[PDB]
């Protein structure tokens, strides 16, 4: 009973300017909970499943980096695409990992905005739902090894 990442992606693309903008203003992920357009956007995708909403929050927030910085195409890792941008320095990523919980989602969004990355969205979605020490580590490893391939 997972979250249809691609359906959600398309759903965010289909939003009215009013809502794309309404959600983009948000500073922290929890403020999304003050937005009605949020609840409307997310609810089919399994919001109202407690054990789902933290994930949903993160996914939406990262999309909320806006306007379309996250562009979808074995799969492409977030780490890989972040490196493929070439805009982002390793130190910053390390800092993403070293930061406590809410801070880490915020910082990531800042990175996404700067990188304008080409990922495999549903993959990034998976990584984003299970977000955890391991997932973080993998973000590092993919980043460094990719940035080193280049």
């Amino acid at each position: 009973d997972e979250i249809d990442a691609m359906a959600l992606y398309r759903a965010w693309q289909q939003l009215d300017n009013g809502s794309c903008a309404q959600i983009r203003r948000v500073s922290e992920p929890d403020e999304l909970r003050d937005i009605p357009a949020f609840y409307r956007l997310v609810q089919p995708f399994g919001w109202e499943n407690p054990r789902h909403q933290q994930a949903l929050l993160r996914m939406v927030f990262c999309l909320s980096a806006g306007k379309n910085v996250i562009r979808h195409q074995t799969g492409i890792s977030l780490g890989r695409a972040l490196a493929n941008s070439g805009r982002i320095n390793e130190r910053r990523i390390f800092q993403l990992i070293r930061a406590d919980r809410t801070a880490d989602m915020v910082q990531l969004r800042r990175l996404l905005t700067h990188a304008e990355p080409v990922l495999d969205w549903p993959l990034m979605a998976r990584m984003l739902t299970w977000w955890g020490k391991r997932e973080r580590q993998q973000l590092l490893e993919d980043f460094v090894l990719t940035t080193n391939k280049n």
Partner: protein, 468 residues
């Protein structure tokens, strides 16, 4: 004291948990089921070897049906006595010019403590096993001291049965198999080293060696400086009333040309485009004995043959599973027992496939940790990061010691690649654990991060390729 008549053999009932010293007649005639109780693995294997050889020259089975029958019923005492007479004359541990596996009037300076024989004070049985060990299995001091015939860390592989006698009997070739394995019979002599000596620097046709002479071949000038107690043995555990401490060494050299056909160890042959050279199996590597089982149970003809004892068994009862003793030397003792289910003779390819699985994993894990270690080295990091693949692989091998045997003991050879794929799993999980476990205490260090990425990537790329 005499190996055939008196009692030596350190022994324990399987369930019965009481140590006893028994005699060959007793072992050959009782429905009692004995196992030997020795404190060392090499010592145990040697005792077994000696007992097998003895059984091999006193009583080969006339046919396979009689082999079976004798395995199933002990002998009457008279039967044994009859079988045992001539030999009685040959097997005394004290004599004038014929002491068991020794040579008279050995001269040197000074004495060697009994200890060095093993590689203290010892009973007759304990000594005779020691003697036989150093002359057969151990490397051997010289240094101007020959060893052989195999020789100097050979790997013995015996077939195991229920009971001690079941085992001994089981590893003794049918007479036709015997005179098949040793054809020419123009061989001076069949008389053992200590009856009709060799003299430096003899040059010897392996084919001139009778099976008696060669099973009991002793390459050393050894004399047992005479016994003292009245008291307790250091191997046997028990009181012996006659114990050896003294022992006399003497340099000696000859040359046996070509390979003698010992029935107890797998011949393996290699052909360089130059030279067709074959030697017995050596524990050359630090691996778990299971790696080598391809050469101990599977025939290939580069290539290898297995102990005539094993191949015989494979012929005799083709429907039976196989309990197998493996023992030898590196110095470092090694002794393992291995079971293969009813299929083994038929399907060696399956066995090979499994050994190959094990090895393939070990390889992937090593390639991974090595690229980490080489990275570590390059960044100039101080400490055991350089040896990670070593240490790790060591752990792996212990684990694999536990894993692979289980598989082979239980496989359904005809049907099952499911269980093989399941082992593939277990191993996969194992390598993951070990990579993480040994790369862990370094991994938090920024600089290393690149080399870690590679490392892990490598572990998994290889690990994918391991699966169909």
């Amino acid at each position: 004291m005499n190996l055939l008549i008196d009692n030596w053999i350190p022994v324990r009932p399987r369930n019965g948990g009481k140590v006893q010293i028994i005699n060959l007649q007793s072992l050959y005639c009782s429905r009692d089921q004995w196992r030997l109780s020795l404190p060392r693995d090499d010592m145990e294997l040697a005792a077994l070897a000696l007992l097998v050889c003895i059984g091999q020259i006193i009583a080969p089975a006339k046919d396979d049906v009689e082999f079976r029958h004798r395995i199933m019923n002990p002998l009457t005492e008279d039967e044994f006595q009859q079988l045992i007479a001539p030999w009685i004359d040959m097997f005394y541990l004290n004599h004038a010019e014929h002491p068991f596996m020794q040579t008279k009037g050995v001269k040197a300076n000074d004495v060697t403590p009994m200890e060095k024989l093993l590689a203290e004070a010892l009973c007759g049985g304990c000594t005779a096993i020691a003697l036989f060990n150093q002359a057969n299995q151990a490397p051997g001091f010289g240094g101007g001291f020959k060893s052989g015939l195999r020789g100097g860390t050979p790997v013995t592989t015996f077939v195991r049965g229920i009971d001690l006698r079941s085992t001994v009997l089981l590893n003794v070739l049918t007479l036709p198999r015997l005179q098949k394995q040793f054809p020419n019979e123009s061989h001076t002599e069949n008389q053992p080293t200590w009856i009709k000596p060799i003299k430096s620097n003899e040059s010897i046709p392996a084919s001139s060696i009778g099976f008696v002479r060669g099973l009991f071949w002793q390459p050393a000038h050894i004399e047992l400086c005479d016994p003292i107690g009245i008291g307790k043995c250091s191997c046997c555990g028990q009181e012996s009333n006659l114990r050896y401490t003294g022992f006399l060494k003497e340099k000696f050299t000859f040359t046996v040309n070509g390979l003698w056909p010992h029935p107890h160890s797998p011949c393996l042959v290699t052909v360089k485009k130059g030279e067709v050279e074959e030697k017995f199996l050596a524990f050359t590597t630090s691996a778990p004995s299971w790696t080598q089982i391809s050469r101990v149970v599977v025939d290939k003809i580069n290539g290898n043959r297995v102990a005539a004892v094993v191949n015989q068994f494979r012929n005799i009862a083709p429907q039976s599973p196989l309990e197998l003793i493996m023992g030898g030397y590196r110095l470092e003792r090694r002794h393992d027992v291995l079971m293969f289910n009813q299929g083994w003779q038929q399907y060696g390819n399956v066995i090979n496939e499994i050994v190959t699985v094990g090895l393939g994993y070990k390889t992937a894990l090593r390639k991974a940790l090595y690229t980490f270690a080489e990275g570590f080295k390059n960044k100039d990091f101080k400490g055991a990061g350089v040896s990670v693949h070593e240490t790790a692989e060591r752990h792996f091998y212990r684990q694999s010691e536990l894993l692979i045997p289980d598989v082979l003991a239980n496989v359904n050879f005809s049907q099952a690649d499911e269980v093989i794929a399941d082992l593939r799993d277990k191993l996969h999980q194992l390598c993951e654990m070990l990579f993480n476990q040994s790369v862990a205490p370094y991994a938090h260090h920024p600089k290393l991060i690149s080399t870690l990425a590679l490392a892990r990537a490598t572990l998994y790329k290889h690990l994918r390729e391991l699966k169909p």
